[PDB]
Each structure stands twice: as C-alpha cells, then as structure tokens.
Amino acid sequence: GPVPSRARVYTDVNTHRPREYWDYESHVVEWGNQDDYQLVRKLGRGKYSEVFEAINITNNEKVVVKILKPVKKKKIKREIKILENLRGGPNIITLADIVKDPVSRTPALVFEHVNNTDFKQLYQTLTDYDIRFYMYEILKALDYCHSMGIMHRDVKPHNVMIDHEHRKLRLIDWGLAEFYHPGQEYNVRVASRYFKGPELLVDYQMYDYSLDMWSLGCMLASMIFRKEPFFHGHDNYDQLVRIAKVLGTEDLYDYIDKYNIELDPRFNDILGRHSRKRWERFVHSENQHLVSPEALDFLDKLLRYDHQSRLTAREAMEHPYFYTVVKDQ
Template sequence: MSVIPTIARIYANVLAGKPKEYFDYDEYKPQCENSENYCVTQKLGRGKYSEVFEAIHVSSKQKVVLKILKPVTALVFEYINNMDFKQIYLELSEYETRYYLHELLKALDYCHSKGIMHRDVKPHNIIVNDIHKRLRLIDWGLAEFYHPGEEYNVRVASRYFKGPELLVDYVYYDYSLDIWSVGCMFASMIFRREPFFHGSDNVDQLIRIVKVLGTTDFYNYLTKYNIELDLKLQDAIHITTRKTWDRFVTTENGYLVNDDAFNLLESFLRYDHMARITAKEALRHKYFLPITSHVATYQYPIASTTSKEDSQIGELVEIDVNNL
C-alpha cells in the first residue's frame, strides 16, 4: 500500500488563484540595475553558492547588503544593523524569549500565507536588531512554493532542525515542517540546550527525537500515513517511553519554563505534521499574552515596520557585478 498524501491544514490553496509567473521562479527576471549605483564597503561572509558584502547605495546613501551568486549575479537586500541570533538566543530573558519567538512566528505566518515554505528555519538564519527589537528571517535558498499533493525533496533543512517527515522520507510535507524547526529552537531557548536534538547524522537525529517523544506515537505516525521505515532505521530504533518536558528543567533554566511554555512546545514538536499547531494558531497561544497585551495587532506587510535608520525596502534587483 502506498504512502498516504496529506494536504496542509492552512493556506493550502493560496496559489490556486495566482498566475503562473507568481511561483514559476525559473522564469523570473529580476529588475536590473547598474552596479555603479553601489559602493562595496566590506565583505560580510560567504557560502557555498554566494558571497555577501555590505555596500552603500550611492544616490540615497542607504546601507544595503549585496549577495553575489556565483559566478556573476548580485541581489540587493535590506540592510539591518544586526547581531547573529545564534549568538544570543540562549541568553535571552524570559520576556525576550517570548517576544522574538512571536516575531519569528509572524514572519512564518506571513510567508506561509503567500504559499511559501522556508524549509531551513534555524538560529543561524535569523538576524535581529536588538536596539529596535526587529527580527528578520533570512536565507531563502531552500524555500519552495507549496502546491497541495506535490512531492517535495526531503534533503532540506539543517540536521538538528529536520522534521521527522524528512527523516522517514515522507515527501508530502507542507508548512508544518517549519513549525517543527521552530519547536527545536524553542526547546533550546527555554532549556538552554543547544541543539536540543543533537544527532551525529540523519539516522542518529531520528533516534534522538524518538528517545524524547517515544516510540508509541512514532509508530502510530508511520501507520497512519503508511510510511515504510528504512531497514537501517528499523534496526536502530528501540522501544522507548515518552519523556515529560519537566525532565529537562534545571535550576539554571527553571525561570524560563511554565505550563504555557510546555503546552506550546508540545504543539510544535509532534510527529504527526497534520497535528502540529500552525503559525497563525501559535500567535494566539496564551504563552504570548505578556507580549500581545502590550502590542497592537500587527498588519501585513511586515516590511512596513522597518525604520529609516535600518533601510528602506525596495524591489529585489539584479545588478551586473563585473565592475564592482
């Protein structure tokens, strides 16, 4: 019997009314701009497929970030006077933990509402301006549009944040994959344990998850969707009972946890992707009452909250980098 496909519980058909050019990125032609409009000031970093520079837009004097895709294409992004979230996310106060998690969920609800799965949510792909308390979810290189019933590549997300669906090769996943990754981050934030699921490879990653969430729910998940477990995984996974979240509470992290935090974490970290809370639902969770009671209801687009001190957000443009 074949695997049972599922359809996202939310935003499943947001692309149905969109023209093909909305999601057909292979045919997308970015607006072109002359490289002489920019002056590179310093190199910020590099990746496998790109190099990143800080630059100045000559006429407006605005700082921007140039991401140069190898070999010759550059994309211009908003500049944020930021710090790497990975450097601070285990040192946040209880209120800051709630606040930045709420901001991250706002970003995810927005991209999900546009039919997009990020597929690589992790601390390294989040930057914050701690002065203005602004958060940006970055690095959309693994992002993909969601179409109901479509099969997707399971070789996405970073190991410590991979959902169980990826680790058992379930190809009909959806936005809920991002929610699992948020749950892994949240567990690290409140338990001061980074990463929370620390596998040495993909097999060990699943083993680490099962050791916490137990085998009963895991095998129920496989049965529900007719997922056949790889022989290597069958041999590696042994019967284990579910751990309670309070087992991870210590004298050092106790001030960060409460029943609301446990309840939210539980709703993030569920084997069954269809049973996970959505970003929209999570934003209304009572864990965030200390935040939402002090903040006006947000409205899209999120970019409208950016101050002039950070940058003005324009259209994504492509420039010829031969003369940079």
C-alpha cells in the same frame, strides 16, 4: 504507496494566484546594474554566500549585498521570485535589487538596510520575556510567507537576525524556500540536521508549511532548556533516534503507519522502543526561570511527529504562551 497529505491552512493560496506568481521557471529576471553598488566591508561569510555591507552610489544609501554561490540557475529564479513576493511582509528582509558580473557573472542579491539598526545573529542569552517576544516576531514572518503560499524550509537560529536595542527581528536566507502546491512531492534535503522534521528524516516528500513549525519548536526547546542543539544527532538516522528518545517511539510508529511510510528494514530495528520523556526532565536549576506551564504546552504542540497535528503559525500566535506579549504590542 505512501498516503498523500495536504496542508491544514493556506492550502490553495498558490492555486488562487495567477500563474506568474509561483511559476518562477517562466519568470524573466530583471537584472540591475552592478556599478550602482560599491562594497564597503565584509559582514559575514559562508560556503553558500559572501555577505557585504555596501552603498548604492546612485542614491547614496546603505544596503546589504549577498554574493550567491554558483547554484543552479533555476534556484536563483526561485529565491528571487520568492523575495519579490514577500516584499513588504513583516520581519522579512526587503530585496532592493539584483545584479551580476562581479567576478565572471555571479548573481548577487541587494537587500535594504534599516537606518540605525545593528542586526546580530540570534543567540541564547535571552530572558524569559525576550524568548517569548522574539518567538512571536518569527511567527509573524512564518505566518506571512505561509499565507503567501511559501515554505521557508530552513528555519534555524543562524537564519534569524536580531536587534536587541530596537526589538527588531528578520528572517533571512531564503535560498531553500519554495512555493507550496497541494499534492506536490518536495526535496527532503532541506534545513540543517538539528531542525529537520520527522517528515524529512523518514523521506516523506509530501510535506507543507508545518515543516517550519517543527524547526521553530527545536529552537524554542534549545532556548528555554539552554541546550543547543536540543536534538543533537550525528547523522540523519541518529537525529530521529534522539527525537525518539524524547517524544517516544509510540507516536512515531503511529505516524509511520498513518501515511504508509516505508522505512529501511535496518532503520525500523535500530529505532527500538523508547518512552516519552517528560519536558520537565530537561528543566535544571539553570533554566528553571525560562520554563513555564505555557512554554511546555506550546513546545509540546509544536514538536509533534504528525505534521498535520502541529500548530499553525497563527494558532501559535493565539497560544497563551504569548498572551502578555500580544497585549504589550
């Protein structure tokens, strides 16, 4: 059988909390009034949700409304309980209300809108300093929710919104977030393909907060090397193939033998052998200003097969890659 795993930091955060903090199935959702919110315009869209700009007619303040997909009711309580516990945390959106019955009883999330802040989706047209700066801001949100015993499990550029005029960042879309409990096996169908950690691609269910650190590394790799996505797989098997062609198959097999992970007989044959390609081979004349000795060292300590050897969110904030960035703050 597979060898169990535990988180290095924030292990027993939920154990020390009261049961009501993390037992979202027992939570009773205090639904608000839909009439208090009138939709102004449509901001974005997607299969999982439709986002709207709206105004709260009671206080005449602008808000953001997210009409949720018809998801299982248990996941609705999970996301609402997580957003309520993360309220007030740095660089995390603030849930203002929860309403229903727009078109035949549909849950909708009402988030606060910050005055005079135009939030746009995270892109790849940033300088070397802005990459450092906004990575540190994401690290703030990852460290806060991890310390609150919560995995985000869907860290990707589409879930990070930026305001380049005011240096404001928000980590959004907590529909896949979940509470961490030591010894609990978790669903491996989380995050997008390009940002799934090796623990998901080998179907290792006892993962922890370090899943978000791998996803964060994939972003850093694509930003500094100007290659989105960095690991460009076409299916879940090919994703681990692309990772193996960079990080080598050597540390991957030692990772599989450590936790006693059982792969498919055909999967172990198609991986083969690959040498650890250097981080400097992806450096070209276009992105030679975004790459530094600190960036490569920091990226290396994030992109590790062993989730227990990757950097924690705080360790990353202590890395010399952000040295001048923290002195600016």
